[PDB]
Design a binder for this molecule. Structure first.
Ligand code: 1MM
Ligand code: 1MM
Ligand code: 1MM
Lengths: 349, 349
């Protein structure tokens, strides 16, 4: 289960831009100084790792971590079992894993001065936000409240510290610049499949509308829905009658229609309530978010698309959290991803 | 050359602590708030990646990136050639690569509020520092000034964008907590060899004094020298008559003496001047820093140690920058590391 034969592996940086400070650089003066003087900074670049099997079959897969995460989530589970990177190299696909701009090995754009500030220019905000352990517990549906598990949970219990340690903040890089980096990667790779998660769901949909090389999308528990501009359907508030899900992203119809040209599957785990749940905000949020996604997929299919929603319990998999690819049954989740790739000819040369 | 066979690979988090905000978490209230209310945060943890060959021989190697870097520098060179991770798995060692706390996939400790601030506590400073491309160019001895290359340079010229994109800022995490994370890793792995670089040089020396499982150290271009407390020798200022090298780190003699029990090699590349160089601050800084290291190694050897300084040009390798393990001749640099491991039996079971 653990062995991997790689024809090659490596990593590289792609995308980003530069910004410059005032003045000029003098090599005779002391170089280590609290100064942006004469300085060029590379910002907003992305880190990319690849592992290629011997005799690859089908298209390369690009695994794109969710919000506050890194490519670690595709390498191993919190309890140390193989992640989708190993499983899909064994399945004879070349596997790319990224750390998007602002996360992990991607660039965090800060300089000499208050965080994110280059002289009088704010590149990213000095004030950050970040989830807590308690917030992530309920966001990821480990259970209804921090420290409590659903009876059926597939989470690797006992490895809570390892799991939460993988999460962190993201600086306020524009989503446009994150999408731009991945479009550039897709141009470099050629035809490929995006496998996204949570926050990267909407971003991968956007990439596909800018990059014909994206030949398929599988999105685990996408966090933000997408619709044609001016065609957002009625979406109810949450059960508290005060809160809303994330405002759906709206794109020009000419771009939205490109989503009808490739197979797209959204995958949801377990324990999303069918009925309003005012006592558990994030459970209710997932109910309405999943509903919004069902309408988004319906809109793609009304344009001639092939967009599907897979609820893992309907496939016989019970208890999955919002990270099904690191849960205890992740091999069975991977099997369902292999099935999708195979049906759509994405595992053939 | 590119093929690699792994018995297993993976990644995990280790080390760190938790800090908490005020109050209690309520799962019925909107979870996504600009608030540290009832929040627990994991901070200062380290990311660790491992790749194990089939039938390893000798001790595992722990590659520890320099300042502002990540484990990427051991994965691949800027022009995409195999890094030391691949080369040493091929050489039958299990290889660990880390992103230390504050860098890459390691934790950046920030919350809801100004960067680094958890309510009234400053976990790390809101004001950051960061090198520029121009500063790094001269720091790493690509040439005497930005845009210029030393004759016979082994830098992968043409891949400057890739190279500089791998560098970034570090938040003000205490060095004690960075050392602590690696001590914990060394306890987890067992007997091992540390391979350090620039800023991580002094940190690896510190780890060895706290961790008997460190059985050898190879340090590329270490940035800060280390001496027994009260026993720092006279070190001259730089040629500009005003600047100094980094204040040497001082440790109690009982800990310093632990450095005499293991083989230690410091490795330097090319173009460090033998004579004062007022016009090029960082070249002169390297001259005096290397001198200080020569005295540190002598101090270890006078306590019965096995410490040595390897100047790559004396071994027949010309043109190396301060990242010799990513230069064009990195295979030959790796061969010298294999030689060190073999001399001391660190490549035998
Ligand atoms: C991996 O999960 C997602 O991708 C994900 C999944 C669902 C919603 C949102 C995200 S997120 O990551 O973009 N953003 C996020 O979680 N932010 C956040 N911020 C605060 C301040 N508190 C909390 O509490 C949960 N969350
Ligand atoms: C990888 O190199 C080292 O490890 C390394 C090598 C030699 C010295 C220092 C470092 S460092 O990385 O700890 N710190 C550093 O470089 N800081 C810095 N800060 C500013 C503000 N400007 C510049 O200009 C160079 N440098
Ligand atoms: C690393 O060295 C330098 O950086 C370096 C150092 C000094 C001069 C030039 C270079 S160079 O690399 O930019 N370019 C170079 O050498 N060009 C060159 N072109 C021809 C056509 N013939 C010869 O030499 C006969 N040289």
């Amino acid at each position: 289960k653990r062995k991997v034969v790689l024809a090659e592996q490596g990593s590289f940086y792609i995308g980003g831009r530069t910004v410059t400070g005032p003045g000029k650089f003098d090599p005779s003066k002391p170089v280590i100084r609290y100064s942006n003087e004469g300085a060029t900074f590379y910002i907003n670049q992305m880190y990319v790792n690849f592992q290629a099997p011997v005799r690859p079959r089908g298209l390369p897969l690009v695994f794109w971590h969710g919000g506050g995460l890194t490519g670690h989530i595709w390498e191993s589970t919190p309890d140390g079992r193989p992640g989708f990177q190993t499983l899909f190299v064994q399945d004879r696909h070349t596997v790319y894993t990224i750390d998007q701009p602002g996360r992990g090995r991607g660039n965090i754009p800060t300089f000499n001065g208050p965080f994110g500030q280059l002289e009088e220019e704010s590149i990213v905000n000095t004030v950050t936000g970040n989830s807590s352990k308690e917030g992530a517990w309920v966001r990821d549906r480990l259970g209804p409240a921090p420290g409590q598990f659903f009876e059926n949970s597939q989470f690797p219990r006992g490895y809570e510290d390892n799991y939460f340690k993988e999460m962190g903040f993201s600086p306020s890089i524009s989503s446009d610049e994150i999408v731009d980096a991945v479009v550039k990667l897709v141009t470099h790779i050629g035809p490929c499949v995006l496998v996204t998660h949570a926050a990267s769901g909407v971003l991968g949909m956007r990439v596909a509308t800018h990059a014909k090389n994206v030949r398929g999308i599988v999105a685990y528990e996408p966090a933000t829905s997408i619709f044609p501009k001016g065609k957002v359907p009625e979406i109810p508030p949450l059960a508290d009658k005060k809160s809303q899900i994330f405002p759906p992203f709206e794109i020009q119809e000419s771009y939205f229609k490109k989503l009808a040209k490739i197979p797209i599957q959204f995958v949801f785990g377990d324990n999303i309530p069918k009925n309003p749940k005012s006592a558990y905000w994030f459970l209710d949020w997932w109910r309405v978010t999943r509903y919004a996604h069902s309408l988004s997929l319906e809109a793609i299919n009304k344009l001639g698309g092939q967009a599907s929603l897979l609820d893992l319990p309907t496939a016989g998999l019970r208890g999955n959290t919002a990270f099904p690819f690191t849960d205890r049954n992740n091999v069975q989740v991977a099997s369902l991803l292999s099935d999708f790739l195979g049906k759509h000819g994405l595992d053939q040369n």
